[PDB]
Amino acid sequence: ISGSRTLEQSVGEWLESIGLQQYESKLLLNGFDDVRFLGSNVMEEQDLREIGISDPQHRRKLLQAARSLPKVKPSGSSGENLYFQSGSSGPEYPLFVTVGDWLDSIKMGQYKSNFMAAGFTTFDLISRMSIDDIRRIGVILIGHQRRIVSSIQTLRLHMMHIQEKGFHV
């Protein structure tokens, strides 16, 4: 586009908007560090307890607020992209052509070497990974683990759908 793009808030600015900024360091230090990757499949009550949000009313408030954030479709890569789209004008869902490009789409590129060192370089390998499997290759921060597993789930849904349609199996 020729015109400007509006930028997303920081986690701190978002928390201030909902009266919960005292939890900023706990979120950031545990990988809840980008407002594009917070909310229902990603942020869970038990995780909030574990990182030290002991106040149950604040946990409920935070979880509801995270659910109110827009779901931002992942950006394609600057190199090659593979997209699924429903309808002539529907949203493009990227499927990626490399593990690195997939990780970059969720700002998790720092973990490419972790996946490579484990030999987890194909979709088929990665698609069945649990949170525990992800932690075990060295993704320690809970907010990053949750982000990755949520992304895997949505990518797997799209890939299964395509397979079920019966042409690219």
Author numbering: 27 to 195
Sentences from the paper on this structure:
Our study reveals that the Eph SAM domains have exquisitely specific target SAM domain-binding properties, although their overall SAM-SAM heterodimer formation modes are very similar.
The results showed that, similar to SHIP2 SAM, Odin SAM1 only selectively bound to the SAM domains from EphA1/EphA2/EphA6. To elucidate the molecular mechanism governing the specificity of the bindings of SHIP2 SAM and Odin SAM1 to Eph receptors, we determined the crystal structure of the SHIP2 SAM-EphA2 SAM complex and the Odin SAM1-EphA6 SAM complex at the 1.5 Å and 1.3 Å resolutions, respectively. A noticeable feature in both complexes is that the backbone methylene of a Gly residue at the beginning of α5 from Eph SAM (Gly954A2/Gly1104A6) is in close contact with an aromatic residue from SHIP2/Odin SAM (Trp1221SHIP2/Phe738Odin). The very high-resolution crystal structures of the two complexes also allowed us to identify a unique interaction feature that is critical for the exquisite specific interaction between the EphA2/A6 SAM domain and SHIP2/Odin SAM domains.
